[PDB]
Amino acid sequence: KNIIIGAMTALITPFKNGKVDEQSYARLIKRQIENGIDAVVPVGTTGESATLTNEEHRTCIEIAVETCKGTKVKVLAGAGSNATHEAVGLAKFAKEHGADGILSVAPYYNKPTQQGLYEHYKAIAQSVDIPVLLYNVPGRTGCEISTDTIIKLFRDCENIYGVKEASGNIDKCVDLLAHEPRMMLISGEDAINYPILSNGGKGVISVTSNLLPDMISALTHFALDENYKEAKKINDELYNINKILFCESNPIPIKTAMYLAGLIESLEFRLPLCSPSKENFAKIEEVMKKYKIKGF
Amino acid sequence: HHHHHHGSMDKNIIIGAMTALITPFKNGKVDEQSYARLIKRQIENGIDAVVPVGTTGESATLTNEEHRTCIEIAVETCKGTKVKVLAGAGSNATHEAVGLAKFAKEHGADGILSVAPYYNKPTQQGLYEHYKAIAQSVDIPVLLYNVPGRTGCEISTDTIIKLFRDCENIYGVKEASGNIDKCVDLLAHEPRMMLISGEDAINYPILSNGGKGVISVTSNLLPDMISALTHFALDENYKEAKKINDELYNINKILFCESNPIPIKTAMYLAGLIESLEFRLPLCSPSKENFAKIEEVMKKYKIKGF
Amino acid sequence: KNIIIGAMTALITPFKNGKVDEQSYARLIKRQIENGIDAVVPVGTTGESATLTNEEHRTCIEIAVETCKGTKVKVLAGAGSNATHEAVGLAKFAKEHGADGILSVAPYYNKPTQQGLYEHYKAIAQSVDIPVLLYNVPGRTGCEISTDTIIKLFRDCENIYGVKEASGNIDKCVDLLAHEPRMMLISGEDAINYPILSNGGKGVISVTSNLLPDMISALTHFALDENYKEAKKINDELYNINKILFCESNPIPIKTAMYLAGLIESLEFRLPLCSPSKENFAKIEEVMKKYKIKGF
Amino acid sequence: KNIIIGAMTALITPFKNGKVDEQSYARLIKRQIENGIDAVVPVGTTGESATLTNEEHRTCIEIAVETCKGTKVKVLAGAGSNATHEAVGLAKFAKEHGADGILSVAPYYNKPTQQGLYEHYKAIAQSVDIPVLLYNVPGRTGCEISTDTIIKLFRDCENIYGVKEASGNIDKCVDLLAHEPRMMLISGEDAINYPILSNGGKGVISVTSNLLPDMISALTHFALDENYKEAKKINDELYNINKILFCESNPIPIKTAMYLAGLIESLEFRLPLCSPSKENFAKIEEVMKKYKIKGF
Numbered sequence A, C, D: 001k002n003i004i005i006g007a008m009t010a011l012i013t014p015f016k017n018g019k020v021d022e023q024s025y026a027r028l029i030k031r032q033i034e035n036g037i038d039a040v041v042p043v044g045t046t047g048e049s050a051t052l053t054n055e056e057h058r059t060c061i062e063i064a065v066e067t068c069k070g071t072k073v074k075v076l077a078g079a080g081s082n083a084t085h086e087a088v089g090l091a092k093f094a095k096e097h098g099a100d101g102i103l104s105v106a107p108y109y110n111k112p113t114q115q116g117l118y119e120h121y122k123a124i125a126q127s128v129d130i131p132v133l134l135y136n137v138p139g140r141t142g143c144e145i146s147t148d149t150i151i152k153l154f155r156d157c158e159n160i161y162g163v164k165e166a167s168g169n170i171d172k173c174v175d176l177l178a179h180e181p182r183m184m185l186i187s188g189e190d191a192i193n194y195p196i197l198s199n200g201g202k203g204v205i206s207v208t209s210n211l212l213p214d215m216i217s218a219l220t221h222f223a224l225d226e227n228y229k230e231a232k233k234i235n236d237e238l239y240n241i242n243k244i245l246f247c248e249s250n251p252i253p254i255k256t257a258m259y260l261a262g263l264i265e266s267l268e269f270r271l272p273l274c275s276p277s278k279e280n281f282a283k284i285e286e287v288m289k290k291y292k293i294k295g296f
Numbered sequence B: 001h002h003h004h005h006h007g008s009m010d011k012n013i014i015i016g017a018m019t020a021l022i023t024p025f026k027n028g029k030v031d032e033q034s035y036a037r038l039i040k041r042q043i044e045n046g047i048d049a050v051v052p053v054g055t056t057g058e059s060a061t062l063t064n065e066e067h068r069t070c071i072e073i074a075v076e077t078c079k080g081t082k083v084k085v086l087a088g089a090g091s092n093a094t095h096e097a098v099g100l101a102k103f104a105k106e107h108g109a110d111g112i113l114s115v116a117p118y119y120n121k122p123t124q125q126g127l128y129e130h131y132k133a134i135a136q137s138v139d140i141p142v143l144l145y146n147v148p149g150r151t152g153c154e155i156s157t158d159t160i161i162k163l164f165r166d167c168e169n170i171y172g173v174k175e176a177s178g179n180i181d182k183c184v185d186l187l188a189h190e191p192r193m194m195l196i197s198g199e200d201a202i203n204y205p206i207l208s209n210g211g212k213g214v215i216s217v218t219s220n221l222l223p224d225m226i227s228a229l230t231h232f233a234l235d236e237n238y239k240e241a242k243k244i245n246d247e248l249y250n251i252n253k254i255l256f257c258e259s260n261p262i263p264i265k266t267a268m269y270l271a272g273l274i275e276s277l278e279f280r281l282p283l284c285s286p287s288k289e290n291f292a293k294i295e296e297v298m299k300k301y302k303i304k305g306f
């Protein structure tokens, strides 16, 4: 099986005058590459998938692919949708425009059954010939991909090689790798990156790495080298910033932090996302003071 | 200039017994001629309003063109009758929801339903700005829609009341949260709003506390019973309304043994009201066990034909 | 069946120098009788069941029985326990000492199965010949008595006549009375007293009635006569105090309010229960100013 | 601080004819000592604390103390209660009768505030001079000891040295040891024993070790010696039995399994606990067949 693992960043999407700032997007991706990141994920939840147009979603995949040329860094394109026909179209676009793989979030809002989830992902995997990583985040979608469904998809479909888990459920992470140890479990919760890696997870798809790419990369690579002491030391040091980046719904805090660090020009969202409360803005600024934030 | 005193300024409303219409498919396309026939069946069985393309209508998997087409068919079919069209126009992107709202206005809908943004979990401030922009885009009634089990977010009682008091067109909320405490909270602090039940099994408890209508899944199958329940309740004949709500519990519950609208489409198919048990992925046929369970509950109810 | 319905009060237990103030207990119950209450419940959760000794628990049942002699008010003695042999002993004491019926909370902490709950209540009901009211409060016990178990118990044991529901689940209340309309459903959540009664419930067991017995009494009797408009008006007017009485864990706010109204001499709890925060103390006082509180 | 760490067993309490089988209890403890277990915990939830009399609870502490005398195995006596005066009395008994420390579950059913929890445990810790381990299990108690309260108690009272966590929340486990790495975090959920130990936890209090003391012992000692690969291997191999032992509420499955293994003479509980369902009886019987169960 082809795989995409290691330290990965769920990229924020910067706006200027309501438009995607395509030149700041490329600059932010190069900053990730230059700080030890193994792959980048354009247009996930962190990238404001919901409020981009279909053209804008596709444009950001192209920029990521272009920016990573000549490097070892891969593009795991965000291509999920709650409509199977939309998700297949995004999968085919990413394949035909040079992405190395795709991420595929579980359908949100319409709550498919486990059978429907299996048929949803089977259609996606049959549409392309590049790796497909499942993405489970029940707090946002309203549904859960069960362990049985995940494992069945891993064994029945060639391109499906693992799952990104954002469920705060370490028991399920043990369940997954105890019954299918060949799968690639990827952490989708920054605060518990180390516990997932220490149980055999093979990477992270990170919000914090937008701000601190070198620290997330070092944490992951320490763990992959079985230097558990050093990986845990970074995970413990990062807890305070990992928590404050979710005081409000992601990506509101991380964009606030990137703005306070001078890495994005303006603190701009697309509705229904908005600026954080003045209280939480001050809380984020205060937590940041304990970390050394790399520039460009 | 904006202000905070819209509560008692005359708000156009859409209340009574309302149906969240299923969307029939034929060879993967919207069966536009079965859609019109089903809406006419609703009109002839005492329903006061219809809601095209909600969650029950598989809004998520329809294209933008198909979503707009189904609103047009509903508007056309209810012309010359007392039945209103409350167009489903929600989106998790504010610019999409504004575009749908303006479409519904410009093509003759009587009002709009607007679900709270799903998946991206906006803050209460974000929800306020989301709804504020939608309501300022049109001049027809806007009913908020709270269903946290599907969206991942909740519109607070405080936010709902602020929107009611700050914007002219927001006139109430459809609640699908299984939280009768919140329903008491809403009408005790803002009794001028229209609380609409979005949970069939508890239609009567919501109406008995001052709710003014239902937006029902069960009425797809049994429109006469849901309409009679509501009109009994609106006339304060609570004994007869409760008697029907009790009779419908078994079917109200079994219609969610799997995720709506999988059971209701199965039942409409078992009743001969649609030609195919067709969904758009990721939705699918129910399990064989749940199929039998649905068939088996239906037998105790009288289902009106065409 | 023989039943105990209507407006009922979950009595607070006052302490004086670390012992139960038995003369304040009697004075408080007499205040309930004179303000339209139909029954009183000694030693529930509100009465600090957990921290009373077995002798004090039994003494408090005795005081309630004595005080309601010669009146229309009944005593529904609190007799629950998470050990069946303890719950049987309390039930038999209540019977032998003149209680009109018993309330029996579902076993807490040890989480029995539905089969175990059935055997638990069957042994209790067979031990006495007075009415037994089940009590479901999953947020405190960790278990739920299923609708099926409640209906089975109602139909299989002669003296079990209903359930007190404190689960915030109006769907379950419709389920209960649609499938077994002969049972007595009793509200155990003050804020939704009117919605439960309007669906056919026949009474409440109230925390707020400790402070405002006349208002809860009028609400219940209005509703039982199908004067729903007048009952809803009181339920709506009581929402603010109904909510603030749970700003902290019951019975901390209600005992605070009774002290703030001068109805008890000292604001004393038994650890692990404690006085509320300074802020919540002031918040309860401010909500109270909007209500008419009867004295002695 | 004095501490009690390592691989520990939450002992089942066998009954025979409705009484505690005191000779089987001692025999079971000797089996634990002989399989590398570092300490035993009499009368927890697994020991049916709720349904034992005050005298039976105290007797089982005495049997554990006597059976482990002259050996290296410690006794961490279960002494919790939802009434502070009861918990202090149990704590003093354990001290006066030779226990090495005490475990003290957070108060169940009456839901104290964080301030009440602090005063509850401060009173317990001041009553004795032996180590005190807190016990958080919100699914059974209805309350949670916050990270702040645990750390404050650890820093303010000499005897309080850690917490047994049974909340399925690895984020909280990272939170605890990142802000107070000197405390002893003890796993209270068998399925995730290895992830908690891999983050710096120093022991387990196990249900599964009743049946497989050698395997739980080996898992813990592998982890404490930083052989993470071998500890994970055992944790992964134990997942199936760890899960089936909670198909129904603990200790119903574990007693069933001990009965099926011939380690106790009768499968009898005290109401409200009861035998499992017939299908669940068969399910436990299977999972056991994949494991090698040591005898006496």
Ligand SMILES: N[C@@H](CCCC[NH3+])C(=O)O
Binding pocket: A049, A050, A051, A052, A053, A054, A057, A080, A081, A082, B091, B092, B093, B096
């Ligand atoms: N509002 C749409 C937009 C999708 C286009 C970007 N992926 C959704 O969240 O599904």
Ligand SMILES: N[C@@H](CCCC[NH3+])C(=O)O
Binding pocket: A081, A082, A083, A086, B059, B060, B061, B062, B063, B064, B067, B091, B092
């Ligand atoms: N999957 C998209 C499609 C919307 C198309 C119009 N109903 C969504 O649910 O937002």
Ligand SMILES: N[C@@H](CCCC[NH3+])C(=O)O
Binding pocket: C049, C050, C051, C052, C053, C054, C057, C081, C082, D081, D082, D083, D086
């Ligand atoms: N702590 C004991 C007290 C029993 C005394 C009677 N309520 C319990 O909660 O079960």
Ligand SMILES: N[C@@H](CCCC[NH3+])C(=O)O
Binding pocket: C081, C082, C083, C086, D049, D050, D051, D052, D053, D054, D057, D080, D081, D082
């Ligand atoms: N049922 C009481 C009795 C305890 C006696 C031994 N701790 C309780 O669970 O607290």
Ligand SMILES: [Mg+2]
Binding pocket: A043, A044, A078, A079, A080, A081, A103, A104, A105, A135
């Ligand atoms: Mg995706």
Ligand SMILES: [Mg+2]
Binding pocket: A259, A260, A261, A262
């Ligand atoms: Mg700046």
Ligand SMILES: [Mg+2]
Binding pocket: B079, B080, B081
């Ligand atoms: Mg006409």
Ligand SMILES: [Mg+2]
Binding pocket: B053, B054, B088, B089, B090, B091, B113, B114, B115, B145
């Ligand atoms: Mg909508």
Ligand SMILES: [Mg+2]
Binding pocket: B161, B189, B190
């Ligand atoms: Mg107000």
Ligand SMILES: [Mg+2]
Binding pocket: C043, C044, C045, C078, C079, C080, C081, C103, C104, C105, C135
């Ligand atoms: Mg009781």
Ligand SMILES: [Mg+2]
Binding pocket: C049, C079, C080, C081, C082, C086
């Ligand atoms: Mg008791």
Ligand SMILES: [Mg+2]
Binding pocket: C225
């Ligand atoms: Mg009258």
Ligand SMILES: [Mg+2]
Binding pocket: D043, D044, D078, D079, D080, D081, D103, D104, D105, D135
């Ligand atoms: Mg204990």
Ligand SMILES: [Mg+2]
Binding pocket: D165, D166, D167, D168, D169, D187, D188, D189
């Ligand atoms: Mg735990």
